[PDB]
Nucleic acid binder design. Structure first.
Ligand SMILES: [Zn+2]
Ligand SMILES: [Zn+2]
Lengths: 127, 142
RNA sequence: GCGCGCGC
RNA sequence: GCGCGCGC
């Protein structure tokens, strides 16, 4: 396990640095989203939204998110209680750590702790 | 419900929608993995030279590179090196099925409107073993 | 789409 | 990275 400040995020395909492990938060203790507003500069969002045959209480899908540099698909946009959040697939984010680059197979098993998303907190850091 | 002849189902990349294959070229490995056995199918996809990692050893096969549309780069699945033979393994959701009744995107191979037969290694080998007598300039050719 | 389990 | 199941 590494302190989260020592873990950076890179696109698994083109390997450009696109984020920081410290910007990740969990939604419903499962989905991992990046809450840093500067992260938006590293991905594109598809015109049409992802179609899901189910209705969720607090969120609805937005478009597909992909690396702005190479087009690699990273996951999708989650519109949580009206707030847009990029949900990342763990395999899409190559981890840059003190022991080298690591490709994790499950968010629940990455070598660092991630805090649960807190809406109130998110509003503080962004208003 | 209705089941279509496999020759009447074409495969298109769910993304760019280019016609890449035919339903008749699919076979099931272990009754689950769906591979395309048409050698000419190779021309429609790319393979990353960095094999997929799986922390499990399989008796008859090992993972190969990640496969994707040679046209748009959409990921289709992974290469399977079965008893030394490379077979492209396709996830159903990455394929768009063009049937006699419009295009259809299934979400599970176990529910497509056609029957995919089992892969047979010996058959595959025979079909692909070089018969030099077939070449006009070979001394065995009649 | 994203997650978890199991299998391969 | 595929399959099956469930969850979101
Ligand atoms: Zn990239
Ligand atoms: Zn394509």
């Amino acid at each position: 396990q590494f302190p989260v400040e020592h873990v950076q995020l890179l696109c698994i395909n083109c390997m450009v640095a696109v984020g920081h492990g410290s910007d990740l938060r969990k939604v419903e203790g499962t989905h991992h989203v990046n809450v840093n507003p500067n992260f938006s500069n590293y991905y594109n969002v598809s015109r049409d939204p992802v179609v899901i045959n189910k209705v969720f209480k607090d969120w609805k899908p937005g478009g597909v998110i992909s690396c702005r540099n190479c087009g690699e698909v990273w996951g999708l946009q989650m519109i949580y209680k009206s707030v847009k959040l990029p949900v990342l697939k763990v395999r899409s984010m190559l981890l840059e750590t003190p022991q080298g680059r690591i490709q994790a197979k499950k968010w629940s098993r990455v070598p660092f702790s991630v805090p649960d998303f807190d809406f109130l907190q998110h509003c503080a850091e962004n208003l």
